[PDB]
Structure formats: structure tokens, C-alpha cells
């Protein structure tokens, strides 16, 4: 199932020059950013999708991350499977680990309020995280078997909503700079 969605969002801070490439490819060059997310993916996420990507350029600085990102509604939940990043001190509620796709991931949950979401500029939502314990090598084909994460989260009481919104292999950042180029299928 080929990608059919182009995510390109920023809060307006700094520069986020995002390029909608051929098929599932995209490029990002960013500097002195506020909050942003960019990437190719799917209009409707699925808990059964296996996501393939190749991040041919990955050079983040600060809290810039290479991650599967997506949302559900009912309830409103943002989720993250983080494979690499620049500098990022992960902290919060911690639920265990999951092994997937040759790596081990730390599981976190966080809450946001008065915060931007796909529902508006000042909303409340929960965030589910799988954060790889070591940064994943980039430049070769990589898989994220997302059902492994959904199921691990489920086993710790982190259930996703029933209405699936976008699901993107993204470059996401906050107060960050860098360069990335990723193909997604
Ligand atoms: C598991 C995810 C995660 O770890 N986080 C997170 C939470 C929500 C949304 C995005 C990322 C961090 C939580 C803690 N903050 C510390 C920031 C800070 C440091 C020093 C003084 C004042 C503030 C940074 C983000
Ligand atoms: C402290 C880290 C941080 O703040 N972030 C982050 C999270 C994970 C990995 C790297 C950076 C941001 C979290 C929020 N998203 C925007 C959410 C959104 C999407 C669509 C419409 C409206 C809002 C951008 C990145
Ligand atoms: Cl995001
Ligand atoms: K294009
Ligand atoms: K751990």
C-alpha cells in the first residue's frame, strides 16, 4: 500500500523548508525552529501496517527526531515510534520495553493541554511513545512493524482510539536545526 499523504506543519518559528518528493520521498532542511513535523505517509493509519523507510540523509541537531507519527480520535491520542534523534532527554511516565525490528524501545506516556493538535490550537491529548534505546542506523531499508508497538502499549493499558487519522514516517522537531531526506513505502 503506497503512501498517499503529505504532512507539512510548523508553528511558524525558524525555517522549515520541506520538499514533497516523488512517491514517498521527501526532504527537509530546518533551522532555529519552533515546533514542526514533516513527512510522507498514509491518510488513514492502521495498527496492522508495516512501515518501510530509508532515511538517506539524517543530520539532526537538538530535539529533531526521525519517527513514525500519527493520531487517533475517540479518544484524541498522538503516538510516536522514535528511531533516531539529535539530542533528546526522554522523560516521563515509563511503562516497559518492546522489541521490534532489531531494536528495543522504551515505552512512555505523556499528556498535553492547551496544545496544538489535529483538532485545534488549544486541545488536550495523551501521547504514546516507543523510543529506541540506541539510535537506529540510517541509510538502508528499515521496517517498523507497528503492530508490535500497538500490542506492547495495549499490554500496559495504553489503548489507541477507534478513529485513525494520518500515519507518517516523519522528521519532527522543536528548537532544532538539521537536514533530512527520507523515502517511505
Ligand atoms: C517522552 C517524551 C519526552 O521525553 N518529552 C516530551 C513530552 C511531550 C511532548 C514532547 C516531548 C520531554 C518532556 C520533558 N521536557 C523537558 C523540557 C525542559 C527542560 C528543562 C527545563 C524546562 C523544560 C521536554 C520534552
Ligand atoms: C519537545 C519535542 C516536541 O515538542 N516535538 C517533538 C516530538 C517528537 C519528536 C520530535 C519533536 C513536537 C511535538 C508536536 N508536533 C506537532 C504536533 C501537531 C501535528 C499536527 C497538527 C498540530 C500539531 C511537532 C514536534
Ligand atoms: Cl509530531
Ligand atoms: K511530489
Ligand atoms: K528501560
Numbering used by the authors: 1 to 185
Question: What's in the article?
Answer:
Fentanyl is a potent agonist of the μ-opioid receptor (MOR), with an affinity of approximately 1 nM and a potency 100-times that of morphine. Custom-designed ligand-binding proteins offer the possibility of both detecting and counteracting toxins such as fentanyl. Following the placement of the hydrated fentanyl into the binding pocket via PatchDock, RosettaDesign introduced 9 mutations to the Fen49 scaffold to optimize the protein–ligand interactions. Fen49 was designed to bind a solvated fentanyl.
We solved a 1.67 Å Fen49*-fentanyl complex structure, which exhibits a high degree of similarity both with the designed model (r.m.s.d. of 0.64 over 184/185 residues, TM_align score of 0.99), and the Fen49*-apo structure (r.m.s.d. of 0.420 over all 185 residues, TM_align score of 0.99). With the exception of Trp63, which is flipped nearly 180° in the complex, fentanyl does not induce any significant changes to the active site upon binding. Fentanyl appears to stabilize the binding site; Fen49*-apo Trp63 and the Thr87 – Thr93 loop exhibit higher than average B-factors when compared both with the Fen49*-apo structure overall and with the corresponding residues in the Fen49* complex. The water modeled at the fentanyl tertiary amine was introduced to bridge an indirect protein–ligand interaction with Tyr80. During structure refinement, a strong electron density peak was observed at this location (3 Å distance and 109.2° angle). Refinement with water at this position produced a strong positive signal in the Fo-Fc difference map, and it became clear that the density corresponded instead to a chloride ion. The chloride occupies the site of the designed water; it is coordinated by the tertiary amine, which is protonated at the crystallization pH (7.5), Tyr80 and a nearby water, a trigonal planar arrangement for chloride typically found in the PDB. A second water molecule is observed bound to the fentanyl carbonyl oxygen at the designed position (2.7 Å distance, 135.2° angle).
